[PDB]
Ligand SMILES: C[C@]12CCC(=O)C=C1CC[C@@H]1[C@@H]2[C@@H](O)C[C@]2(C=O)[C@@H](C(=O)CO)CC[C@@H]12
């Protein structure tokens with residue numbers, strides 16, 4: 713009902729920039745030896761710190777806040793690894809031109825640490841996404857929208873409490889990315905981005921397989937997990953292994 717307020721309201725893409733979290737530090741102890749146990753524990757600790765900021769971000773995410781508390785918690789639990797790896801590839805791309813894996817300003821992995829972490833192939837998989845960011849010259853606008861799409865890429869096999877509202881919100885963000893890419897090779901760009909998003913499901917499946925394994929054997933492996941991750945994984949693992957998690961694809 714206000715001509716002025718309507719013209720001044722920031723675009724959804726603009727609000728995404730405003731609510732994007734500041735980069736979080738890992739609190740990496742450079743004195744300790746770079747063994748798998750230490751590096752994986754440090755990364756899990758970093759993950760806990762990041763997820764606290766991700767939750768605060770989702771809370772002010774347009775459209776998301778409108779979903780039932782049950783659906784929000786569910787979406788965050790199902791997509792945390794996807795958001796983590798995607799944001800990792802973005803930082804590596806932005807801050808090191810995809811030369812290294814930039815987990816945090818105080819924790820940058822080169823080939824040596826990827827080997828030392830005991831999850832080398834997984835790191836290479838995430839690094840490959842960063843290499844695609846370079847090949848595509850992905851923009852921060854495209855990135856922020858794609859991250860929202862990842863938050864909405866895995867749902868309960870039987871749907872959310874408000875399945876209709878969710879689909880509506882997902883559709884709008886899809887149109888947003890479609891507008892950003894927007895003409896000539898606009899269709900091709902859109903296609904490449906949605907294809908990249910689909911490829912995230914396979915990578916995340918492998919990352920989770922490893923996450924769940926070190927979680928079950930955390931005592932024998934001496935891999936530590938922060939309360940935030942114990943909380944997420946404890947609940948996520950049984951749902952995923954029971955087949956209650958449904959991946960949403962653009963193609964296939
Ligand atoms: C979230 C995480 C760190 C924060 C960040 O910037 C990007 C990522 C994505 C990859 C994630 C790491 C972190 O969880 C360590 C792992 C998660 O448990 C590994 C373990 O299983 C260790 O126990 C498997 C995959 C790893």
Ligand SMILES: CCCCCCCCO[C@@H]1O[C@H](CO)[C@H](O)[C@H](O)[C@H]1O
Nearest residue numbers: 748749830831918921922923925933
């Ligand atoms: C210090 C700990 C190093 C651990 C390296 C673990 C590499 C685990 O690799 C894991 O192996 C398994 C074997 O059954 C699983 O099925 C998981 O798919 C796979 O990610």
